[PDB]
Amino acid sequence: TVDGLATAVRGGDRAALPRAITLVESTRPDHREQAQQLLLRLLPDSGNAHRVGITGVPGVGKSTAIEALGMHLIERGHRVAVLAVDMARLAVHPNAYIRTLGGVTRATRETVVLLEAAGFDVILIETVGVGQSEVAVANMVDTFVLLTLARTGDQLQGIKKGVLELADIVVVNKADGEHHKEARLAARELSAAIRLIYPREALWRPPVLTMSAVEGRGLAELWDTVERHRQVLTGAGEFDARRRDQQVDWTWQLVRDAVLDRVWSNPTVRKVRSELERRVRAGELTPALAAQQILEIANLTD
Amino acid sequence: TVDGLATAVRGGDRAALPRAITLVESTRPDHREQAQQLLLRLLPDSGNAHRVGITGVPGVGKSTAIEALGMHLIERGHRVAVLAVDMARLAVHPNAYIRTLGGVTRATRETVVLLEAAGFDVILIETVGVGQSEVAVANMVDTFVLLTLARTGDQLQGIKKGVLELADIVVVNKADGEHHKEARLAARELSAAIRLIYPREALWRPPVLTMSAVEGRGLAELWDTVERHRQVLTGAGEFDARRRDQQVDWTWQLVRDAVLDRVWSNPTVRKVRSELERRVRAGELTPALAAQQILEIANLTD
């Protein structure tokens, strides 16, 4: 019935999909093994989709933009899924589906495989600035979009530094009310910075667009740019290359996390960490000697 | 004579220091243990120094700037060490000392402890864009300086993206000949981008300076800014905080590298990696199943 579940999901059975996602989200070691066989079976039916990441600060307008984009897309014949890695008009529609960082990252990546196997051709993955969540989403999508504020000199308030460089497309949102002209200036400032950061880029220099997600303006143009991104990368053979690299990278991350977890989650290492850290912070112990004691203690109690 | 070596180094014996550095650089497992006791003994004599990282593309003018800065400093009573993580006027002077990423990072960090114990109060650490070398240097210094070109719209040619955000101070070098006016404009462009990236920074927004390292102009002003950096961070209690955090982070990196090495350097894992990677890249195997096989195989042959 792993085979049964896989037949149901790829056939479009709407009841099978949530159950597969639950199987996939199960931390229970016996479910992990079934989940893996199911994914192995569905892997060949996946990949036929554009995965788009969406980030920006609380209140910048991510969920408003996502609802609007999702309707834009549904009306053009797509089947759209929305996941979040920490929208009522959208969630009612039959062609939409709305649903540790290591743990949530893993469950989200596996869930994408199920959704694509189930016929979803657009996958929107939303995140906020929590820990390393932006990098995790950027590493599982084709196109990563950053929403910013439409204020000259203040577009990136509250964004973790380094996040700008993850973006394939940058959007100055809320380009309405008293800020039409200002949004254009704000966009031109970000474009100037992107030109500095990507001075001789030949394939894809991140465009900067304006949008009013609440007035439904610039959404279509945003999606037109997302499609151009895929077309440009596909013509260079880089769309498939990025995916293959992400998958290999993720494989090694899983290896890393498995071996590091043995140490990090050891209760006795947990008990003595503070004092070993205090001793390092105070110059009483070298980092190499603290590291050795951490490994010795893990080994003694594993 | 670990005790003997430690007494000689902290007493200023110029012959002891190179030998300690050689001990520290020894990959031989018996030397590592002596090295650790020596560092433990010298740790309390270290820290009385300003550690400055210097990066930028090949030919931007790093070694020219370093030689000039090092003489500037020697003439002001400092004892200056220069390390490189991949200058003849300087190397002749008695108050100067010129000398795997994980391995070189480790040896450089430990060497800083020896140098500081030996009376060096300025440590300049040079790197280029090789792998993750910039981040490694930024994580072992107090102040990280990025040199760029003095050309409008082309300052960051050849720099890995994300490196700009590591900088505490940015310098447009070669502000001479036909580019005096242009260097000022180039500096103003980078300043604009830094204002965008750090829109509401209250403690330290990276200044952008001009320099002609070959005409010895702007070096003094660069050092004045490096001192201001330390003064500002020290007044906020952040200079010591950054160091303590770097040391703790490095401790855990050593733990990580020790446990991951058991897998990464296993010959049998090395043999089968390509095919397991090929199978992942082709959608024949899930990343989680490839990861499990990697761990199983390491375990079988360790």
Ligand SMILES: Nc1nc2c(ncn2[C@H]2C[C@H](O)[C@@H](COP(=O)(O)OP(=O)(O)O)O2)c(=O)[nH]1
């Ligand atoms: N003026 C203006 N306001 C907007 C726009 N898009 C969203 N908003 C409003 C709706 C909410 O009151 C608030 C936050 O929106 P949201 O969509 O919940 O933001 P987010 O927290 O999901 O990023 O901003 C927009 O395009 N213009």
Ligand SMILES: Nc1nc2c(ncn2[C@H]2C[C@H](O)[C@@H](COP(=O)(O)OP(=O)(O)O)O2)c(=O)[nH]1
């Ligand atoms: N015009 C000009 N040329 C400079 C300046 N500083 C260094 N140079 C020259 C000296 C070398 O010919 C070349 C590269 O300098 P370098 O100091 O070896 O660069 P790097 O590879 O260590 O970064 O550039 C400078 O400030 N102005």
Ligand SMILES: [Cl-]
């Ligand atoms: Cl492609």
Ligand SMILES: [Cl-]
């Ligand atoms: Cl301090």
